[PDB]
Design a protein around this ligand. Structure first.
Ligand code: NA
Ligand code: NA
Lengths: 509, 124, 62, 62
């Protein structure tokens, strides 16, 4: 049980009952289940039962005969109660949590349904059929450790966890998918729009107070203006902007105090927004120290937060159907695809730039070379104006070949206008069609980054219900474990035995 | 609206529908991003140079924040005039801060639309 | 027969002859076609025969 | 060989800079005398550290 599984790595749960099932040996498991001396409850050095370590090895569907799902089914349906399943090991978590925290995709599909067709042990299922009335069934998942109503559930640990490459497929599963669709539907659509309404109106009032013709003098006017002047609306901005810079800094200043995976593998989900929201809030309130003794960077530092206050405005695009899909087809690109450009384009920028500067730099090159500014870096700045359509052409010589030098400029032109510009186009011919038909899943994660954030932002009594409370699964006494309703569809009919009600669709009466 | 009668020639109208499915919701993914960087970087480049007699006798000549916005789109298309000055901030550093706007929407936001059409039109 | 089929939604045409065929039960249809008391012509609250509601559910080939 | 590759890039990317830097120690100041050799007359240091670097790292690389 050493990590880095090259170092041998065979944490099967260190009991003879466990590797019976872990090695896909079905007859020897039933051989062990007949002995009265056989224990299942007994834990490990990590505190694990047979169910924990059976979760820890599935890894796949390809490199698995789909037996780990069977051995899970064999070990509960032969014997067990809910005390065998709700056991926590050394780390404090349900074995349902561990399928999410380790990131096992295939086995967590089975834990959420686990339908029981037989009669004596239908209590331990996680899925029920209310009524059939033909090919239109109504779904009902158990939802007792799944939604964020307790501490450290599966939905909180499936969103706030790095180190799993398989998250965007996980939320497709049915007790997670429609529930997260429902919780966004009834209030988090509205709580997201007002967060954009309070923030897009924030960036305007930042911009408007810089353009109430606010100079009129040498340079006095800070847009504070709580001191002398006559009328209204010069005061409504600062009671708005300074407070909405204050609260946005405190909220992000504590939301940064959760994340240990700061930048390793944190490409875009958590790094580039909670950092940039905090930096933009700092630079606005930094102007208070700039108004203290009129430090000369009072405005140049201030205006940098303005554009970066409009730059991080792109974050609220996540939440419109395909607009955020465009927002992730750029945010996967703007880090490591201009990196393949800029670590090549600069390598030809200064590359050909040294040859074109020294060839013409001897004498009175252009416009009275006695006082006018111009150097090596001038030919570098003229080189980028050659790329974009500015393209001035005043150019001279001393003792080298003029039109041959103008032809040597064309050597730089044939790269990065037909070649290095367009290999990036050829790079996007394969990368984005890999992101397309897959951005739909990974943007859905970025939706889930916000939905649980609004759950943590509101510690009220939660009048918004999002479940159906105290609905009975099956017992004579146990009428508990609040529930969920969905709908199903057509063929493979069968005689539906286990119902729960006298075929209604809605509530009776 | 003379474009409507193109529908009825064999593949000419096929070109007329490969634009008409595009001109609503694919410049929408451009214009609700391009404007968000147009006014985005435009506020930083205007206030950095706007203190004094900026360009060509600033006593009667028209020019403001919106002038630097109109110069910004003439930077995108190949008009590209370059008469530019300073008062009390860093000139060539500001000219390098113009390049920050150049690296978007000439190699990036222009070409993610190209990468958008690499999948959408072969579906059309 | 409520729209928004999440609200249960099973407009099969409200006759015992109809959902015999709508539920892919072929032998029970021939069982109903032998009785002289069996009507096919009789309509619904929407006025539908067996043919109308049989059209209303195919949705697909998959 | 990860380490032996990085030092081959470290010795070579630092080579191209010193080629570029000796062409821009404002090295004209006259009609055209200054080769960046400068092993002959002038006063201070670092005018000599380049040629013992560049000429040797052009010799061994050839
Ligand atoms: Na072009
Ligand atoms: Na293409």
């Amino acid at each position: 049980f050493n990590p880095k599984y090259q170092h041998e790595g065979f944490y099967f749960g260190e009991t003879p009952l466990a590797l019976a099932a872990c090695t896909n040996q079905p007859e020897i498991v039933q051989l062990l289940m007949e002995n009265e001396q056989t224990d299942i409850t007994s834990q490990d050095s990590r505190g694990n039962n047979i169910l924990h370590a059976l979760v820890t090895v599935a890894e796949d569907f390809k490199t698995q005969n789909d037996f780990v799902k069977r051995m899970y089914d064999m070990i509960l349906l032969r014997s067990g109660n809910w005390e065998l399943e709700t056991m926590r090991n050394n780390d404090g978590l349900t074995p349902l949590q561990l399928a999410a925290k380790m990131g096992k995709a295939e086995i967590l599909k089975y834990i959420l349904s686990r339908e029981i067709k037989e009669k004596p042990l239908r209590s331990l299922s996680r899925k029920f059929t209310d009524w059939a009335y033909g090919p239109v069934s109504s779904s009902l998942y158990d939802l007792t450790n799944v939604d964020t109503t307790t501490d450290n559930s599966v939905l909180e640990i499936i969103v706030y966890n790095t180190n799993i490459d398989n998250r965007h497929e996980m939320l497709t599963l049915e007790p997670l998918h429609t529930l997260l669709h429902t919780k966004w539907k009834k209030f988090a659509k509205y709580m997201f729009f007002l967060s954009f309404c309070f923030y897009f109106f924030y960036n305007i009032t930042l911009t408007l107070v810089s353009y109430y013709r606010p100079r009129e003098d040498e340079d006095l006017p800070h847009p504070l203006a709580l001191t002398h002047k006559m009328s209204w609306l010069q005061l409504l901005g600062r009671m708005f902007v300074l407070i909405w810079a204050t609260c946005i800094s405190v909220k992000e200043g504590i939301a940064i105090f959760l994340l240990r995976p700061s930048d390793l593998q944190s490409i875009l989900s958590d790094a580039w927004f909670h950092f940039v929201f905090f930096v933009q809030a700092v630079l606005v309130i930094l102007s208070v120290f700039l108004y203290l003794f009129a430090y000369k960077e009072y405005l140049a530092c201030l205006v940098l937060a303005m554009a970066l206050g409009w730059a991080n405005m792109l974050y609220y695009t996540r939440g419109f159907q395909s607009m955020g899909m465009y927002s992730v087809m750029i945010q996967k690109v703007i880090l490591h695809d201009v990196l393949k450009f800029l670590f090549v384009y600069i390598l030809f920028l200064l590359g050909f730039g040294v040859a074109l500067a020294s060839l013409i730099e001897k004498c009175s090159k252009d416009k009275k070379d006695c006082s006018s500014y111009g150097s090596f870096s001038d030919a570098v700045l003229e080189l980028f104006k050659l790329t974009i359509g500015l393209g001035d052409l005043n150019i001279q010589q001393n003792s080298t070949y003029p039109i041959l030098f103008l032809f040597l400029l064309i050597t730089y032109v044939i790269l990065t206008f037909v070649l290095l510009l367009n290999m990036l186009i050829a790079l996007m011919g394969e990368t984005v069609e890999n992101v397309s038909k897959e951005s739909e899943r990974i943007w859905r994660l970025q939706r889930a980054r916000t939905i649980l954030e609004f759950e943590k932002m509101l510690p009220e009594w939660l009048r918004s219900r999002f479940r159906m409370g105290e609905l009975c699964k099956v017992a004579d006494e146990d009428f508990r474990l609040c529930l969920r309703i969905n709908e199903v569809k057509w063929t493979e009919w069968k005689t539906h035995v286990s119902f729960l009600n006298e075929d209604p669709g809605p509530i009776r009466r």
